[PDB]
Design an enzyme around this catalytic site. Structure first.
Site, PDB file in Angstrom:
ATOM      1  N   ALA A 261       0.803  -1.215   0.000  1.00  0.00           N
ATOM      2  CA  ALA A 261       0.000   0.000   0.000  1.00  0.00           C
ATOM      3  C   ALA A 261       0.838   1.267   0.000  1.00  0.00           C
ATOM      4  CB  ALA A 261      -0.939   0.010   1.196  1.00  0.00           C
ATOM      5  N   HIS A 262       0.145   2.373  -0.220  1.00  0.00           N
ATOM      6  CA  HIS A 262       0.763   3.691  -0.272  1.00  0.00           C
ATOM      7  C   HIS A 262       1.634   3.969   0.944  1.00  0.00           C
ATOM      8  CE1 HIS A 262      -2.817   4.197   2.188  1.00  0.00           C
ATOM      9  NE2 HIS A 262      -3.589   4.023   1.131  1.00  0.00           N
TER      10      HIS A 262
END
Ligand SMILES: [Cl-]
Ligand SMILES: [Cl-]
Ligand SMILES: [Cl-]
Lengths: 357, 357, 357
Positions: free
Chosen positions: C258-259
């Site tokens: 994820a980011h």
């Protein structure tokens, strides 16, 4: 109007700093979000950053109470703040009701993502009876099949395949390499990341004398307005009726939505969630990362399921739900796991001891 | 012949209704499945639907005992029924041994999926020493590499990449955007959904002084006949010998099959299953959604593993297997999880109490 | 120099046998890995195989102590062995410090994977202000966007999309159908399998009166040297700063990063791992298959997490960590799960019994 508040606001906001080759004055940024500039509006702003990370050419914001202590020390050029935090602030404040929401809006002004001009790339293959609005863009090597409809202001990325009779409503955005099968109907302002597959045939088989027999999957998919679909996410077509995704549904990456699932409006699902066939999820739900739902259950509105939970039954009461165990050092976990296997025996022995005492 | 029955038949069948622009008489549909028409065979049928959902132009069926009560109220034009349920039925029955199996067969007659004509799209790149049967179809922007063999009646979708020396047997169907690496051998009548990747290099590394060293993955993949592979599913090539998939194996979406796995005939795996390297699964097994297998274990025939279970050891006895905990409201789960960490202490204290009493 | 040893060496090595159309003498293979040939160096070798699987035209090796008993019975033409095992060996030994590491190196000599010649396919679309080194290869229907930089000796597979300003360092290899969004910077010698998506927008939303509001994801991705990325793996771009992947990081298939995640040097992650936003993983860690990490936690160096564990908190001590339960036959598991729900009651009753005794 009744007041609103959502627990998701508690979540820590990622730190970071972005420096841009674009610039806006503080006044221009403030006008975009209806902020009151307490200080000089003429300062050029060349990026966005969180408090401890910001420099004097950047606009910052206060989102989490845990970072309030760092506000007076921030080197930001200006800060989005509530009126309460702006009171006695030594620098330039942009006063708004909700700094994080203002930041969310302003972030788009600095986005470097490519924006394609209207038109169809010479290498795109568009069926004669497909309809592509003249304001849409279609990228290189995209394939648009018979009867497909591409709405106004839609961006179709390179290598997309849009199946027969499929529809993308006004303002949609598909990254490169999105696949829609036939009979996928999508409303307005969709956002689909690369690798997503919408309308595939899911597992539809009946067992006959040990041999699996294929059931044709002859429903489609209906997706509402303002839906997000993450990278490599898959959404099956229905068996007879459509798989249904409501308005404002936000799906993260690597999600698996099975045939005939229904997702209610404004529900969010985090990455790696798997929803088995015919599960129905209500409105304003949140499923955390890696949650699984068994098939043919229903979840009511305002349900939150925590990470990696296996949801085994219908949920009729709003609230939070969980399964699994606490993480432990492996050697300690092994002892716990051994005792779990002994629990039925332990319970029997506790009952016998109670009788004896 | 010995009688057959499989517990999967207990599963609820998705509800729905499909209306078609195609039509068949009841007589034509009955002939396809060997049904006895008890009523007028001349009625045109324009779709398929479950009992409560069906209208008078649709054929329905009874699959789950839970819907038997709705049979007399169904508005279906006709219903696939056993002889027992047809007895005293007020409408037109199509009498068959197994209504659901008959429906499974008939569903294909209403499928709207595109069927490509034989031929190679002008934009397809086919190596001179690749062999594509003249009855096969190859879609736009597909790439067929050196020595690849595409059998009779195969459909290769747009944007597929078929690697060097890879083979697709007669009657195969690949959706758009399937990738085969080199040395992937597939038998007859495969069905592969979009985004699948077959023959990739999986994790093959040895640790040398803290630094991972690549092991070349120089085996291939062998897939049998009548295999289904779902959307975005990945199947690694082998390290030395091939990864092996048997006949009639049905793989759902977003599955990960690691290097050197072997899957026996007629095994089914639900979506999001992950199988670690060198695991061997027998025949007629079922792994439910999100199941994981550790590497280098073997599962015997006729094993069922329930959703999100972590399979940690070889299974030598047929049956069902599970891991995890019951789902609870989060606050209640937190208390359970805290007590699980105390279990070793609890067990010790129970033992001491038994000694005292 | 201090001695090294890693527990991963305990893992069983997959069995198998590969026969090649290439050939090398034993002397040539020995020279590649600095082996001492104890026997005739002139023997042609036409493949590689594990001990029980090897024939007389193949080189084998001893990696796991569990197969030492089969060494004298192996039909291998020669065997990579330590000096200790070579002592009294009846055949030809290639004596090395570490047979498995030698095999890892030699495996590449027999790899059948295609190697493209330098040059850009006529059907590739390369922006005028993109820079492709003349020694790089770019495959059919690849798209290289404005400002992208493709380094020396890079192979870009068919259908790849390389987004604006993205960089691939010297010696990189991208399989067909890899997608990089804009502003993805990759160091040297990357290896990316088909279907990977790097730089997508992850879930970035704020809740306003029940409606999710998009936050633009305006950071990028920075990936170090010698990184492996498996099939259909996704790595999000950052919100403001880049998502960060260190040097020598090895990611298996179907991983979700994820980011704003940070992964330290030489960390390995097995397939189906999901890492939530802003998690930071140290150096020399290993996450087993299906592990999940919640967001905004930190894992120190030298941490191992076992399969399908849910990691809920920061880890500050090196070691192994686990969650979940033992697998049991389903009927037995159901009883255990029922007792887990009774644990708070059981604990209370045990406390009351202790008071009574
Ligand atoms: Cl903040
Ligand atoms: Cl039914
Ligand atoms: Cl060995």
């Amino acid at each position: 109007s009744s007041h609103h508040h959502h627990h998701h606001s508690s979540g820590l906001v990622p730190r970071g700093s972005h420096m841009s080759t674009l610039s806006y004055t503080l006044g221009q940024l403030a006008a975009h979000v209806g902020a009151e500039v307490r200080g000089d509006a003429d300062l050029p702003i060349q990026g966005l950053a969180t408090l401890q990370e910001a420099g004097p050419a950047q606009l910052s914001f206060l989102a989490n109470p845990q970072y309030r202590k760092y506000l007076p020390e921030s080197r930001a050029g200006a800060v989005l703040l509530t009126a309460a935090d702006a009171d006695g602030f030594a620098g330039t404040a942009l006063v708004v009701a909700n700094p994080y929401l203002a930041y969310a809006s302003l972030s788009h002004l600095f986005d470097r993502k490519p924006k394609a001009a209207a038109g169809i790339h010479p290498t795109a293959i568009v069926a004669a009876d497909a309809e592509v609005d003249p304001s849409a863009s279609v990228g290189a090597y995209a394939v648009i099949e018979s009867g497909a409809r591409i709405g106004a202001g839609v961006s179709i990325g390179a290598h997309c395949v849009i199946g027969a009779r499929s529809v993308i409503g006004e303002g949609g955005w598909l990254a490169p390499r999105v696949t829609l099968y036939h009979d996928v109907t999508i409303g307005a302002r969709v956002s689909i990341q690369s690798g997503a597959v919408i309308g595939g045939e899911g597992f539809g088989f009946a067992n006959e004398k040990g041999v699996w027999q294929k059931i044709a999957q002859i429903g489609g998919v209906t997706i509402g307005d303002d839906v997000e679909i993450g990278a490599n996410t898959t959404i099956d077509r229905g068996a007879l009726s459509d798989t249904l995704i409501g308005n404002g549904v936000k799906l993260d990456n690597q999600i698996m939505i099975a045939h005939n699932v229904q997702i209610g409006d404004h529900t969010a699902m985090a990455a790696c969630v798997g929803i088995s066939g015919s599960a129905k999820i209500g409105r304003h739900c949140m499923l955390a990362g890696g949650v699984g739902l068994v098939g043919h259950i229903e979840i009511c509105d305002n349900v939150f399921v925590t990470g990696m939970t296996m949801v085994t039954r219908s949920i009729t009461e709003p609230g939070s739900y969980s399964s699994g165990t606490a993480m432990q050092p492996a050697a300690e976990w092994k002892k716990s796991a051994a005792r779990i296997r002994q629990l039925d025996d332990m319970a029997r022995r506790l009952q016998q001891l109670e009788k004896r005492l």
